[PDB]
Design a protein around this nucleic acid. Structure first.
Ligand SMILES: [Mg+2]
Ligand SMILES: [Mg+2]
Ligand SMILES: [Mg+2]
Ligand SMILES: [Mg+2]
Ligand SMILES: [Mg+2]
Ligand SMILES: [Mg+2]
Ligand SMILES: [Mg+2]
Ligand SMILES: [Mg+2]
Ligand SMILES: [Mg+2]
Ligand SMILES: [Mg+2]
Ligand SMILES: [Mg+2]
Ligand SMILES: [Mg+2]
Ligand SMILES: [Mg+2]
Ligand SMILES: [Mg+2]
Ligand SMILES: [Mg+2]
Ligand SMILES: [Mg+2]
Ligand SMILES: [Mg+2]
Ligand SMILES: [Mg+2]
Ligand SMILES: [Mg+2]
Ligand SMILES: [Mg+2]
Ligand SMILES: [Mg+2]
Ligand SMILES: [Mg+2]
Ligand SMILES: [Mg+2]
Ligand SMILES: [Mg+2]
Ligand SMILES: [Mg+2]
Ligand SMILES: [Mg+2]
Ligand SMILES: [Mg+2]
Ligand SMILES: [Mg+2]
Ligand SMILES: [Mg+2]
Ligand SMILES: [Mg+2]
Ligand SMILES: [Mg+2]
Ligand SMILES: [Mg+2]
Ligand SMILES: [Mg+2]
Ligand SMILES: [Mg+2]
Ligand SMILES: [Mg+2]
Ligand SMILES: [Mg+2]
Ligand SMILES: [Mg+2]
Ligand SMILES: [Mg+2]
Ligand SMILES: [Mg+2]
Ligand SMILES: [Mg+2]
Ligand SMILES: [Mg+2]
Ligand SMILES: [Mg+2]
Ligand SMILES: [Mg+2]
Ligand SMILES: [Mg+2]
Ligand SMILES: [Mg+2]
Ligand SMILES: [Mg+2]
Ligand SMILES: [Mg+2]
Ligand SMILES: [Mg+2]
Ligand SMILES: [Mg+2]
Ligand SMILES: [Mg+2]
Ligand SMILES: [Mg+2]
Ligand SMILES: [Mg+2]
Lengths: 141, 260, 203
RNA sequence: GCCGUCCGGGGCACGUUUAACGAUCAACUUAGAACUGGUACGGACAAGGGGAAUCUGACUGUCUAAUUAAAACAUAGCAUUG
RNA sequence: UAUCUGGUUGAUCCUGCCAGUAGUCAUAUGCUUGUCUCAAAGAUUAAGCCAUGCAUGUCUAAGUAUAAGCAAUUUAUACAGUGAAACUGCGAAUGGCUCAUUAAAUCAGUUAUCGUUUAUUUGAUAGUAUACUUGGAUAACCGUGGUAAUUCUAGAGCUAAUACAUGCUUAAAAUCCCGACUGUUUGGAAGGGAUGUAUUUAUUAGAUAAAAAUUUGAUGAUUCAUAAUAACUUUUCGAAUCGCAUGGCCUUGUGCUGGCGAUGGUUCAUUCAAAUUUCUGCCCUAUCAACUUUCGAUGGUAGGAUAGUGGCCUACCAUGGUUUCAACGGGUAACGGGGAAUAAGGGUUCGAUUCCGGAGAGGGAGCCUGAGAAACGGCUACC
RNA sequence: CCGGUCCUGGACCCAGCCGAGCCUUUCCUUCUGGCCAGGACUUUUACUUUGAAAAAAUUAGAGUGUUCAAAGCAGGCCUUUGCUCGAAUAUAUUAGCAUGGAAUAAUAGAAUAGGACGUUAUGGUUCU
RNA sequence: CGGCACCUUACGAGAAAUCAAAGUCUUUGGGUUCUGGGGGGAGUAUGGUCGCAAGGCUGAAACUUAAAGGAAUUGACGGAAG
RNA sequence: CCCGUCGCUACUACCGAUUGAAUGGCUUAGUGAGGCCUCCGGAUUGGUUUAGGGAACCGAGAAGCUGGUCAAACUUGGUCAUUUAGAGGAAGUAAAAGUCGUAACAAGGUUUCCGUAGGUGAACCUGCGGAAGGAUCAU
C-alpha cells in the first residue's frame, strides 16, 4: 500500500512544504478535530495517507445526524456498507416487525474495519451517489 | 414553482393575526423586511384589525400615504411592512407610541408606551463577526447591522438601540438570572428568569426559565430574548399581565371576579 | 439539454426510475471549454443569478507562482506535457486544471538574477558562460551588493528546478479552471511533487 | 614481469524477500484515438438467400457403370423361430 | 342504544350464507315541493375537441415631451400645466385551472447547506494614488410604399435619455519593492514604481496546560470570518441622473458654499425564496426470485460541467450495489397530506375537490429573456 | 381531630398516599473556578415518564341570546367625543429531538488473563 | 418411571353425537406451523414447474344458485334382527 | 327419494388452422427537424483612425459554413400489454321433467366409500391396496 498510487500526485490542498526550509524535512500535515466529542485517531495526525473525504485529514465536515450500525461489506475501496436494524410498530396488531436499512459510509484509512464491527458514522455533504455518512468511530465485534 | 409567491390565502396566514375565516379569500402577505413572514405583523393588520382606525384596506393605505405611520422612527408607506418584536410604531397625529411585545396569550398586544421609552428598542444579537477591512459588526434579530460594537458583546446578548442614531447604548450579557421573554413556541409571551442553560453541541441548546409564580418551563435558546438585567427589572415596559401564564381555571376565576 | 439531475439514473438497488418531470433549467450543464493554446479568445457565459463565467477557448499566457521564492509572474505557456485524467488532452494540448505544462522561464530568471545576483541552469556553454559573467559583473552600488550579500545562502535552489532553466522552460501545474474563470494560472513544480511527475514524463 | 577468466581465503563495506527495480533482447496479436477521401474500404479473389407449413424416410450410410439417388435398400432399436 | 329479525325441517338444535335494518361531505334517478339562513356544482366517461368575448398590465413633484394634442397667460424666449404615442423601468415565473403521469417517486413529520444562487425589502458599506459635465445612434413623428391576408413591416428625413458607449474631479500620511550616488561595518539616500474595490492563482496571520535556567473574532467542528505578501484580468464599480425649496459667507464674482427628497450603485448581513439534502413511514400482486453492470451499475483518483455537492458527465482503475426483513418486475377504475364517512373499543372504507406540497398546459423535445421559467393567455421544431 | 365555619384557612394528633436525604460492607462519573459554568472520561439498545415539536381549517371543547339554530368570532357597559373581557384549551403520534426511571426483554465484560487499581508506586521509551 | 389402551363420572366442554381432552375458551392472551370463509362451476381453464407417461404440485374467472350441510327427535319404510 | 348418457332450447366461458386482426407502452437499428455551443465567414457600418489619389489598419457585425451536444419525429424489427374475429371441438349451467336404464339412500337387493389401473350406451363394472363414515365396539 502506497500513497502515490494514482496518475495524479496526491496531496492535501494548500498545504505547502517549502523545500528551501530547515533540516526538519517532514511533510507538513494538516488535520482537524471533527467536534462532538470524537477523538482524532493518531493515524490521521501522524499518518501519511491522503484522503480528501476523510473527516480528520480531508475537507469534509461532520454535521447533521450521527448513526450507528453493523458493518456488512468492506469490498469497496474506502467505502463500507453498514446495516441498521430497527423495529417498526404496526398499530393495528399492537406489535412490531423487524426491518433493516443499508447505509453506505465512507471510511478513511485512519480506521480499520472488518465485516461485523459496530461503527459510528456522522453525516457529511454528498461525497458519492449513495454516500452521505462518514465513519467516525470503530468498535471491534 | 418558477418563482416567489406573492399571495397569501386567508386560511394559511399566521394564526396570531387573528383573522376571520369568511372576510375574504386572501390575507395580507407581509413584504420582505426586518422580520420573518411568520413572526411579523403587517401594518395593515395593526391599523385596521387591532386599532380599528381604518375600516378597510383602502383606508389604511390612505393613512400611510399621508406620512403618519413611523416604524422604529422612520416613515413607512408599505401597508404590508413586516413590523415585528420590539418594533416601535409612532402615530404622532394621535400622539401615540406602541411597542410590539407579545402578550401571554401568544399574540401581539396593543401596548402603548411613553414618548421617552419610544426613543429606543432592544435587539437580540444573532451573530458577531468581522466585516470588510476588519471592522467587527453585530446583527440583531431585526436585521440591523451595527458596526464597532463593544468587544464584550456576543451572541444571545441584548443590545439597547438608540433608534434615532442606530447606535448601541448598552447591553446585557446572556447569563443565569437575566429577565427573559419567550418569542417562539407554545410558551410564547411568557416572562421569567434564566435558571439553567443546558448545552447540546450540534443540536439546540435548551434554557430553563422560572416564572414569577415559580413555574418552570423549558424552551429552545432560539426562542429566548433577554429583556432585563434581573427579575423585576425589565428594560422595556411589559404588557398587561406581565407575561405570567394562568391556567384556564384561573382565568375563569379572574374573569368572574372582574365582572362581579 | 445537458442535465445534471439524478432522476435519469437508476437507483442504488438498480431499479429504473419512471419519468418524474421535464428537464428543469436549474439543473442544466453546458459544454466543455476545451481550452487550447493560441491567441487569447474568451467568451462570457450568463449563469444563474445573472452572474458571469468566462470560457477560455484560447490562452497564451498565465500567472504562475514560484512557491519557494514567494514570487508570481505572468509568463507564456509552451505546451501540455502530462495530464492525469486523459492522455488525449496532452496530445491535443488542452489546458484544464491540474494539467502539467511547460512555461517560459525568463520572467522568473530575470527576477532571480536581480534578486540574488547568481545565474541558473548552470550550463557551461559559451553563451551561458558569457551570461554568467555578465550578471556577476553587473554594475551595482555598495549598498546593493550588501543587500544581495545578505540574501546569499538562501540563493541555492533545488537541483531539479535549477537544471530546468538551461532549457528555458519550467514544469508547472495549472491551478485555475480556464473554462470557469478564463484564467490559466498555476504554480511551478517543486519538491517531491516535481519528482513524481518527472518519473511520469521520462517513463 | 605482463594481462585477463579457473580455484580460493582477510576484513571495512555492500543482499535479507520495496528485484514492486535496472540492463539487454524479442513474435505478432488484441483494444482504443485522431486525421483523411467523390461515403469509399471482405474494393480483385474468395464467399450462406431467408422465413411459415404439409406429405414422407428417424438420422450418417447404400444401389439401377450407360435415361430412375428416391419415399427404395441398409441401419441402430424391437419381436418371433431353431 | 356495545341490539338484531325472516328463510333449509313433519318438528328440533346448529354451521352457514341469502334477505331484511340504519348512516354516507355519496353519486344518479323517480315522484313531490310553501317560507328563512347556508351552500356544493363537467372530478368519475374523453389531460377528448373547441366558434365567440373577456381573463395582464403599469406614471409619480421627482427617467425621456417641439403631439403640427388640450388648456391658460405666466415667476418664465431652453423647458415648467395637463397629457395621447413611443423609448426607458418593472410586472407578465403571482394568481386561476386540472389530476394525466407518478409506488421510495411525490408527500408528511424531522434534519442539513462547514455544499449553493437569491430581483426585491430592511441595516450597514466606497476620499485611492472636456468637469461650468463626453459622444453617436434610435423610436414615437413626417411622408414614400408592398402584401388577399396577421399585434407584417421596408425605404427616406428628424430628435431625447436613469436607453447605449465612454470618461475626469480629493484628504493626510504611511508602508513595500527597485535603486543612481553616498556613508564606508553596513547606515543615509535622489529618482522610479505599488497601494480602493472586484477577478484568478500561490504563499503567510488567523495562537491559546498552569512557574523556573505585544495583539489575535466566531463555531461542536473548518483550509471559517478577516487581514497580509507576489502577481493576474478582451478591467467589475468608487453617481456625466431627477424633484422641490432656495438658505449662509462676503474677497458682491452668475464667486464660494448648502436643505429635504427620487432613482441608482459594490460588498456583507437580513428578508421573500430556490436548489439539493438526513432519518422513518406508502395500496394489490410470487400465475414476478433474482435484479443492476454493452452504452454508469457500486466505489476510487483526476478533470469537465454546474449557482454549488454528487457518476451529474468524461478518462483511467477496481468489482462492486439491492434482495424472502420481498429486491426486481407487473397492476392500480393511484397525485401525496391536512382530512371525510361509519364507528363501544379495536377497526373498515374514502380523500379528483375550499388549505399545504407536487406535476401539466394536445403529445414530446429544445430554448430566449430574466433574480427567478426548460414558461406554453413566450418562442423554435416535429407528430 | 383539632375548628381556627364565612363552603373556607394553621402547628400539634392519628393513620393513609407520593417524594426526598443520610446510615447500614453501598452503586448514584470525574477535576477547576467555589448548584452554575468551564474542562476530561463514558457497553449497546428496546420500553416507559416528562418537555419541546406535530400550520391553519376540520374534530373535541371554554365564552358569547346569530330573535332560536346550523353558524360566526364576535361582543359588553346609561348610551358614552370612550371605557372595556375576548378570539381559550385539549387531541395529534409512527419517526427524530431533550429528559427522568432501571422493573421487564435483550447486549458486553476478567479464563492460554493481552484483567482492574496504585490518586503522589519505581524506573525507561518517546511526543508537545 | 415410560408406553398401547380401557372403565366410571362430568368439575368442565360441546349443536349434539360425544370428549381426561374435543377441559383449564366473552372470567376471551403458554410457544409456534399449516388450513377454511354459503352451495355449485371446480381441483375445471390458463400459465408455470416436476414426470418417460399416467399424472403430481401450484391454481382462477365468467356464470349460476337459497340453500347445500352437521347432529339429534318422531314417524314411515327395509328383499335387517328379536 | 334419486344418478348418468342421449335429444330440444337459451346463456356463459374455454380450446382452435388463420405465421388472425386492432389499439397502446417499452426498445434495437436506420434516417433525422430544430435549438444551443463551437468553427470559420464577412452583406454593411463606425472610425484605433493614417494617408497625396486615399492606402491602410482597429472595432462591431447579418446570412451562411465546420464539428459537436441535447434530441423531437418517422421507417423497420422485437417485445410486452389490452380488446376482438373464427370453420370446428369439448364443457358447464338454466329450463322442462322428453328417451334408456336403475347407480346411490334399507344388507337399496353384489355393503358403501378412497387411491390407482383397465373396460364399458349411460349410470357404472372389475382387479389391487386401504377406510368404517358398517350391516360387527362382543365369543
Ligand atoms: Mg389494535
Ligand atoms: Mg418547492
Ligand atoms: Mg407591496
Ligand atoms: Mg448548526
Ligand atoms: Mg408503471
Ligand atoms: Mg449578484
Ligand atoms: Mg433417408
Ligand atoms: Mg459427416
Ligand atoms: Mg442409371
Ligand atoms: Mg441420375
Ligand atoms: Mg426401409
Ligand atoms: Mg337439509
Ligand atoms: Mg316447511
Ligand atoms: Mg345486506
Ligand atoms: Mg341504504
Ligand atoms: Mg362545459
Ligand atoms: Mg371543478
Ligand atoms: Mg405640452
Ligand atoms: Mg419593484
Ligand atoms: Mg401556480
Ligand atoms: Mg413493487
Ligand atoms: Mg440596499
Ligand atoms: Mg432612419
Ligand atoms: Mg445604464
Ligand atoms: Mg470531483
Ligand atoms: Mg468520482
Ligand atoms: Mg466512464
Ligand atoms: Mg389515494
Ligand atoms: Mg390517475
Ligand atoms: Mg387530494
Ligand atoms: Mg381521474
Ligand atoms: Mg392546490
Ligand atoms: Mg384539451
Ligand atoms: Mg405543444
Ligand atoms: Mg413548454
Ligand atoms: Mg389558454
Ligand atoms: Mg400561465
Ligand atoms: Mg465562585
Ligand atoms: Mg391543526
Ligand atoms: Mg414521540
Ligand atoms: Mg354445557
Ligand atoms: Mg370416556
Ligand atoms: Mg381419547
Ligand atoms: Mg365457497
Ligand atoms: Mg343426518
Ligand atoms: Mg399474416
Ligand atoms: Mg436511434
Ligand atoms: Mg401489462
Ligand atoms: Mg340400485
Ligand atoms: Mg342387482
Ligand atoms: Mg349395491
Ligand atoms: Mg367388468
Amino acid at each position: 500500500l502506497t500513497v502515490q498510487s494514482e496518475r495524479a500526485f496526491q496531496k492535501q490542498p494548500h498545504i505547502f512544504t517549502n523545500p528551501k526550509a530547515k533540516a526538519n524535512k517532514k511533510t507538513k500535515r494538516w488535520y482537524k478535530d471533527v467536534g462532538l466529542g470524537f477523538k482524532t485517531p493518531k493515524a490521521a495526525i501522524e499518518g501519511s495517507y491522503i484522503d480528501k473525504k476523510c473527516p480528520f485529514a480531508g475537507t469534509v465536515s461532520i454535521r447533521g445526524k450521527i448513526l450507528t450500525g453493523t458493518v456488512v461489506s468492506t469490498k469497496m475501496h474506502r467505502t463500507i456498507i453498514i446495516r441498521r436494524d430497527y423495529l417498526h410498530y404496526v398499530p393495528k396488531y399492537n406489535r412490531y416487525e423487524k426491518r433493516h436499512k443499508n447505509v453506505a459510509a465512507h471510511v478513511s484509512p485512519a480506521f480499520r474495519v472488518e465485516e461485523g464491527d459496530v461503527v459510528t458514522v456522522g453525516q457529511c455533504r454528498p461525497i458519492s451517489k449513495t454516500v452521505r455518512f462518514n465513519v467516525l468511530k470503530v468498535s471491534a465485534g | 414553482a418558477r418563482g416567489p409567491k406573492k399571495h397569501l390565502k386567508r386560511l394559511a396566514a399566521p394564526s396570531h393575526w387573528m383573522l376571520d375565516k369568511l372576510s375574504g379569500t386572501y390575507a395580507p402577505r407581509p413584504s420582505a423586511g426586518p422580520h420573518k413572514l411568520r413572526e411579523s405583523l403587517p401594518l395593515v393588520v395593526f391599523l385596521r384589525n387591532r386599532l380599528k382606525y381604518a375600516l378597510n384596506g383602502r383606508e389604511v393605505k390612505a393613512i400611510m400615504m399621508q406620512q403618519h405611520v413611523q416604524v422604529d422612527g422612520k416613515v413607512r408607506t408599505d401597508t404590508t411592512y413586516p413590523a415585528g418584536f420590539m418594533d416601535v410604531i409612532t402615530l404622532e397625529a394621535t400622539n401615540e407610541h406602541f411597542r410590539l411585545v407579545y402578550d401571554v396569550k401568544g399574540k401581539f398586544a396593543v401596548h402603548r408606551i411613553s414618548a421617552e421609552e419610544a426613543a429606543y428598542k432592544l435587539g437580540k444579537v444573532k451573530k458577531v463577526q468581522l466585516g470588510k477591512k476588519g471592522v467587527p459588526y453585530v446583527v440583531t434579530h431585526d436585521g440591523r447591522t451595527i458596526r464597532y460594537p463593544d468587544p464584550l458583546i456576543r451572541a444571545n446578548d441584548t443590545v439597547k438601540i438608540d433608534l434615532a442614531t442606530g447606535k448601541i447604548d448598552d447591553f446585557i450579557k446572556f447569563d443565569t438570572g437575566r429577565l427573559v421573554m419567550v418569542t417562539g413556541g407554545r410558551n410564547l409571551g411568557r416572562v421569567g428568569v434564566i435558571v439553567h442553560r443546558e448545552k447540546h453541541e450540534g443540536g439546540f441548546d435548551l434554557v430553563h426559565i422560572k416564572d414569577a409564580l415559580e413555574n418552570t418551563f423549558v424552551t429552545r435558546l432560539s426562542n429566548v430574548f433577554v429583556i432585563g438585567t434581573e427579575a423585576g427589572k425589565p428594560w422595556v415596559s411589559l404588557p398587561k399581565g406581565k407575561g405570567i401564564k394562568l391556567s384556564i381555571s384561573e382565568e375563569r376565576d379572574r374573569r368572574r371576579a372582574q365582572q362581579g | 439539454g445537458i442535465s445534471r439531475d439524478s432522476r435519469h439514473k437508476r437507483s442504488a438497488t438498480g431499479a429504473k426510475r419512471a419519468q418524474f418531470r421535464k428537464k428543469r433549467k436549474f439543473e442544466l450543464g453546458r459544454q466543455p471549454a476545451n481550452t487550447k493554446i493560441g491567441p487569447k479568445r474568451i467568451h462570457s457565459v450568463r449563469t444563474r443569478g445573472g452572474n458571469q463565467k468566462f470560457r477560455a477557448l484560447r490562452v497564451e499566457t498565465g500567472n504562475f507562482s514560484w512557491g519557494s521564492e514567494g514570487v508570481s509572474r505572468k509568463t507564456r505557456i509552451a505546451g501540455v506535457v502530462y495530464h492525469p485524467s486523459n492522455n488525449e488532452l496532452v496530445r491535443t494540448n488542452t489546458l484544464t486544471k491540474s494539467a502539467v505544462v511547460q512555461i517560459d522561464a525568463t520572467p522568473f530568471r530575470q527576477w532571480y538574477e536581480n534578486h540574488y545576483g547568481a545565474t541558473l541552469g548552470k550550463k557551461k556553454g559559451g553563451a551561458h558562460a558569457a551570461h554568467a559573467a555578465e550578471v556577476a559583473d553587473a554594475k551595482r552600488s555598495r549598498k546593493v551588493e550588501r543587500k544581495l550579500a545578505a540574501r546569499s545562502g538562501a540563493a541555492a535552489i533545488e537541483s531539479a528546478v535549477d537544471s530546468q532553466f538551461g532549457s528555458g522552460r519550467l514544469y508547472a501545474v495549472i491551478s485555475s479552471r480556464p473554462g470557469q474563470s478564463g484564467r490559466c494560472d498555476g504554480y511551478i513544480l517543486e519538491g517531491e511533487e516535481l519528482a513524481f511527475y518527472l518519473r511520469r514524463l521520462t517513463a
